[PDB]
């Protein structure tokens, strides 16, 4: 499943080295994750928790925080920022 990220997500992916306009979900998650890890949006004590308030990611996802353990929720928010090819 190749997807085409909407402007805002494309901007975040490319901010961590992404170069294409089209990607597989695994590549999206990889860059999305390198973005979180690079910025250190996660909590040191509760490392599965992400704080993205006032961030590009918070804008993207529409939430102030989320847990990486909630896969369906993460998939939902990501899907809202891409069109499936
Ligand atoms: C599946 N996956 C990844 O591919 C990347 C891996 C990565 C880490 C560092 C540098 C490059 C690539 O991120 C994973 C991950 C990110 C953040 C947290 Cl808090 C936990 C796992 C994890 C992940 C990516 C995105 C999201 Cl929203 C949740 C988890």
UniProtKB/Swiss-Prot annotation:
UniProt record similarity statement: Belongs to the MDM2/MDM4 family.
Induction remark: By DNA damage.
Tissue specificity statement from the Swiss-Prot or TrEMBL entry: Ubiquitous. Isoform Mdm2-A, isoform Mdm2-B, isoform Mdm2-C, isoform Mdm2-D, isoform Mdm2-E, isoform Mdm2-F and isoform Mdm2-G are observed in a range of cancers but absent in normal tissues.
Record gene name: MDM2
Coiled coil location: none
Function field: E3 ubiquitin-protein ligase that mediates ubiquitination of p53/TP53, leading to its degradation by the proteasome. Inhibits p53/TP53- and p73/TP73-mediated cell cycle arrest and apoptosis by binding its transcriptional activation domain. Also acts as a ubiquitin ligase E3 toward itself and ARRB1. Permits the nuclear export of p53/TP53. Promotes proteasome-dependent ubiquitin-independent degradation of retinoblastoma RB1 protein. Inhibits DAXX-mediated apoptosis by inducing its ubiquitination and degradation. Component of the TRIM28/KAP1-MDM2-p53/TP53 complex involved in stabilizing p53/TP53.
Entry's free-text remark on domains: Region I is sufficient for binding p53 and inhibiting its G1 arrest and apoptosis functions. It also binds p73 and E2F1. Region II contains most of a central acidic region required for interaction with ribosomal protein L5 and a putative C4-type zinc finger. The RING finger domain which coordinates two molecules of zinc interacts specifically with RNA whether or not zinc is present and mediates the heterooligomerization with MDM4. It is also essential for its ubiquitin ligase E3 activity toward p53 and itself.
Post-translational modification comment from the UniProt entry: Phosphorylated at multiple sites near the RING domain by ATM upon DNA damage; this promotes its ubiquitination and degradation, preventing p53/TP53 degradation. Autoubiquitination leads to proteasomal degradation; resulting in p53/TP53 activation it may be regulated by SFN. Also ubiquitinated by TRIM13. ATM-phosphorylated MDM2 is ubiquitinated by the SCF(FBXO31) complex in response to genotoxic stress, promoting its degradation and p53/TP53-mediated DNA damage response. Deubiquitinated by USP2 leads to its accumulation and increases deubiquitination and degradation of p53/TP53. Deubiquitinated by USP7 leading to its stabilization.
Residues covered by region (Necessary for interaction with USP2): 1-85
Region (Sufficient to promote the mitochondrial pathway of apoptosis): 1-76
Misc: MDM2 RING finger mutations that failed to ubiquitinate p53 in vitro did not target p53 for degradation when expressed in cells.
Subunit architecture: Interacts with p53/TP53, TP73/p73, RBL5 and RP11. Binds specifically to RNA. Can interact with RB1, E1A-associated protein EP300 and the E2F1 transcription factor. Forms a ternary complex with p53/TP53 and WWOX. Interacts with CDKN2AIP, RFWD3, USP7, PYHIN1, and RBBP6. Interacts with ARRB1 and ARRB2. Interacts with PSMA3. Found in a trimeric complex with MDM2, MDM4 and USP2. Interacts with USP2 (via N-terminus and C-terminus). Interacts with MDM4. Part of a complex with MDM2, DAXX, RASSF1 and USP7. Part of a complex with DAXX, MDM2 and USP7. Interacts directly with DAXX and USP7. (Microbial infection) Interacts with herpes virus 8 protein v-IRF4.
Entry's localization field: Nucleus, Nucleoplasm; Cytoplasm; Nucleus, Nucleolus; Nucleus
Domain SWIB/MDM2: 1-84
Entry protein name: E3 ubiquitin-protein ligase Mdm2
Disease tied to this entry: Seems to be amplified in certain tumors (including soft tissue sarcomas, osteosarcomas and gliomas). A higher frequency of splice variants lacking p53 binding domain sequences was found in late-stage and high-grade ovarian and bladder carcinomas. Four of the splice variants show loss of p53 binding. Lessel-Kubisch syndrome: An autosomal recessive progeroid syndrome characterized by short stature, pinched facial features, prematurely gray hair, scleroderma-like skin changes, small kidneys and consecutive kidney failure, followed by severe arterial hypertension.
Recorded superkingdom: Eukaryota
